[PDB]
Amino acid sequence: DFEHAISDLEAHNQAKIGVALVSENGNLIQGYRANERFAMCSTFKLPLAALVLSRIDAGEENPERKLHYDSAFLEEYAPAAKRYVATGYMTVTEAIQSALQLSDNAAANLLLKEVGGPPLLTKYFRSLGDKVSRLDRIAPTLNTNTPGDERDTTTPMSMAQTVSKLIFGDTLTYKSKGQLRRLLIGNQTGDKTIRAGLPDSWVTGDKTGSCANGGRNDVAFFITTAGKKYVLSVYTNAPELQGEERALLIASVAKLARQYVVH
Ligand SMILES: [Br-]
């Protein structure tokens, strides 16, 4: 069965793994430690982009608005923000794309400043029905992945359910939904994680996260050849593996999920 298989992977790897596979309507199909708390890491940027798109939907935000910043706003990992900084801004669109596809921390932090900070992202989660996910810090200190710390955390089911509502439910307009989906499909950081375990005929979009204390996470949506729609969340702590082995670990979880996914 599915839960014993993940348990076996936990054993070989001396790792903690949380996984949730959820349907188009948010029902848990298979899970393992699906209700345990893990650090979100950069997976929070997916809901953050969704909040900004929701503000665009409501007319409260303009995709072309200039978000002004200077050198002091940059982060150690902020490859797009470093490129744009001499111009004095990134547009909302450029910040969304950079935060999602590159995981640019400064792009994310510009978006957080615009939505009213970690507390307003937490409120957005609550407004979707997610009872668990919470942001408290800005990037990157939210990556600390400390034991027993509940700041900046979700559960595999919460996040997968949240993402199924965004990607497949009615939270976003058709335009925003389609943009979020296409942005996530063009994610540049996830080729070795969940996608690597899924057949290349399936449409897949994802957002990864890498944290301290061996933290490596991915959440993906996919659409099968039959047209069946799913979200898979994989949250892992594997402080003994090397980075490439942490990505292999996630891909292996995804292979098991692939197996289970059927007509
Ligand atoms: Br992050």
Automatic annotation (TrEMBL):
This is Beta-lactamase. Disulfide bonds join C41-C211. Gene3D superfamilies: DD-peptidase/beta-lactamase superfamily. The lineage of its organism: Bacteria, Pseudomonadati, Pseudomonadota, Gammaproteobacteria, Pseudomonadales. NCBIfam families: bla_class_A, blaBEL. Belongs to the class-A beta-lactamase family. Keywords: Antibiotic resistance, Hydrolase, Signal. It catalyses: a beta-lactam + H2O = a substituted beta-amino acid. Its EC number is 3.5.2.6. GO terms for biological process: beta-lactam antibiotic catabolic process; response to antibiotic. GO terms for molecular function: beta-lactamase activity. InterPro entries: Beta-lactam/transpept-like, Beta-lactam_cat, Beta-lactam_class-A, Beta-lactam_class-A_AS. Residues 30-236 form the Beta-lactamase class A catalytic domain. PROSITE patterns: BETA_LACTAMASE_A (PS00146).
